[PDB]
From Swiss-Prot:
Record function comment: Ubiquitin-like modifier involved in formation of autophagosomal vacuoles (autophagosomes). Plays a role in mitophagy which contributes to regulate mitochondrial quantity and quality by eliminating the mitochondria to a basal level to fulfill cellular energy requirements and preventing excess ROS production.
Pfam families for this protein: ATG8 (PF02991)
Residue stretches spanning the membrane: none
Effect of residue 23 to Y: Increased interaction with WDFY3/ALFY, no effect on SQSTM1-binding
Keywords: Autophagy, Cytoplasm, Cytoplasmic vesicle, Cytoskeleton, Lipoprotein, Membrane, Microtubule, Mitochondrion, Phosphoprotein, Ubl conjugation, Ubl conjugation pathway
GO biological process, one term: autophagosome maturation
The name this protein goes by in its record: Microtubule-associated protein 1 light chain 3 beta
Effect of residue 64 to A: Impairs cleavage by ATG4B
Distribution of this protein across tissues and organs: Most abundant in heart, brain, skeletal muscle and testis. Little expression observed in liver.
Amino acid sequence: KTFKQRRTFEQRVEDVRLIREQHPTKIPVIIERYKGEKQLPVLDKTKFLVPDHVNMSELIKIIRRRLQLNANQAFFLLVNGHSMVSVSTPISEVYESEKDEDGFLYMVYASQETF
Ligand SMILES: Cc1nn(C)c(C)c1NC(=O)CC#N
Ligand SMILES: [Cl-]
C-alpha cells in the first residue's frame, strides 16, 4: 500500500542513485496522504523531483496547487515523521538532516495537526 511496502530497500536505493545520475539538482521526495485522512484528495503520484533551492514554505504552496485546494482548506506537512521547526529552510539543507537511509525525503499531509 505505502511506498516503502511497494518497493524493497534495495529498489528505493537504486532509484535514488538514478535520480542522482539523471537529475543531479533535484531532491527525491516521497509525498503520501495520512492513512486517517478524510478531507484532502490523494495526489496523482508519490515520487517528486523538487528543485534543491526551494524552501519548505514554497513546497507547501506547490503541493496545495497540485491538490487544487482553496484558501480555507487546512494543510499540514510532516517531514521524516514530525513537524517542521521552520518552513524557511532550503530543501537542500532539510534533505541533509531529514533524509531516510534509502535516500528519499519522506513527507505526509493531513487537514489536522493531530495526525
Ligand atoms: C555503485 C555503488 N556501490 N556502492 C557500494 C555505492 C555506495 C555506490 N554508489 C552509487 O551508485 C551512488 C550513486 N548514485
Ligand atoms: Cl537536474
